[PDB]
Amino acid sequence: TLQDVLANDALVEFATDKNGCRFLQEHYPTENDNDVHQKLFRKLVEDRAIFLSLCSNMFGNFFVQRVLECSNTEEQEILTEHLATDLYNLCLDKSACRVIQLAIQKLDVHLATRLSLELRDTHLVRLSIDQNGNHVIQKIVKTLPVSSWTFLVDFFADDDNLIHVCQDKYGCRVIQSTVETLSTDQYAQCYQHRVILLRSLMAGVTRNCTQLASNEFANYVVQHVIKCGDALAVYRDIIIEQCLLQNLLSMSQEKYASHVVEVAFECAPYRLVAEMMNEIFEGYIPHPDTNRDALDILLFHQYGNYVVQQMIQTCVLGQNARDQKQSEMYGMWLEKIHGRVMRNAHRLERFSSGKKIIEALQS
Incomplete structure (x- = not known):
């Protein structure tokens, strides 16, 4: 027929x-x-x-x-x-x-x-945040060579374009796909071409990290940088050291940036875990009177309690470190957190989050 x-x-x-x-x-x-x-x-x-x-x-x-x-x-x-x-x-x-x-x-x-x-002279912000065109941009990035879509990296060196695309349900997946494509198989290319393109992306991520991490969807980009190792690990530390330090207490109390703080406490090396712990502990946020410590605030906070739980989990997993100084330092940090929870345990039992923290310290 x-x-x-x-x-x-x-x-x-x-x-x-x-x-x-x-x-x-x-x-x-x-x-x-x-x-x-x-x-x-x-x-x-x-x-x-x-x-x-x-x-x-x-x-x-x-x-x-x-x-x-x-x-x-x-x-x-x-x-x-x-x-x-x-x-x-x-x-x-x-x-x-x-x-x-x-x-x-x-x-x-x-x-x-x-x-x-x-597509290089079109409304790429609209196409990246679109319900349908975002899959086309991701397919182009994941499939074609970088020379076929290098303009997209050049389109995302603008800070306004990066903020507009990252702060969306679909465009943050586009940014994650671009970062994941450029970072893969680095140090097997003998020249720093994808390295320079990835630096061009990560400089814009670094300069805007406080706005991105506090967003509903743009925090996924920051967690993607921190969680993925290999060629992104060096950028992870940068986001921990240039953007997150001196800002742990403010971001841990925030609805979406507290996830970034948990992921940073999970994935950081001992070098940066030490500085983050000393900032949460008797360091920054001094309270030079009888007001609340930063750990005191985060224990009784609806979003900072998960940061405290991640600190507990990090110290428990880090007691088994190969280095002895690192292992005893993780043990001392867990002793500090356990003592502060047991000080406020009768207050924490009246709430669901504090009961979760005490049950976590049980097991």
Whole structure:
């Protein structure tokens, strides 16, 4: 019946139907030299408006994906030009962005490079925070070489663009994908190119870390820097030392930055764990009277109590350190925290968080 739909010119009438597009998708000739394959491709790409309306459709996008799977480089050139005419609005659509991601996966690397470079002068903040275009940006970053999307790094060297993209549910995933792609397989490249691009990102992260860590979604970027080791570990310490120190008590009382403080207490080396512990303990936040200590504030706080729990967990896991001085220092820190909890234990038992802390000190 495929020759019947070739003769009646009802390729739109099948692809705009669920059963019709399933019939086109199942019986599509995978061989490029087939006559029915060539005829169906020609009927697909005769009208650019018809092709782009089929990409933007609930069902016909699957037929466009099936054509894109069974494609040689000439067909890929035709489809690349047709998509690049309206690429930016194609990524914003729920349907056509699937076609764009399969294009980034399955086209030749110069054609997908052309598609990635067609986005370099568009509203990339809107595309990164979009419900649908964020997957296209992530697919471009994770799939294509860095030279195909280096402009994105250049787009994120602006602080306003980095803050606007990071402070969003979808754009923070874009920033995480870019950071995770650039950091991977460093010190196996013999030159510092991805290192310079990653430094260009991390300088903007470092200069804006207090605003990013206190945000609902932009704190995930900071936790991604701290939690991931390897080439990001050197940046982790920087965020601990230049941005988080002298600010532990304020961020630990904050709704979203307390997560960053927990992740920093979890992942820091002993060098920075020592300075963070001495800031929380009898160091900064001095209270030069009979007012509350920083640990006294964080014990009875709805978000700082998890920072105290992470301090307990860090010291418990750090008693088994290979170094003896580090092990006795983690033990002394846990003694300090345990003594301060046991001082206020009868007060802490009246609340859920304090009961959780006391049960954590049990086990």
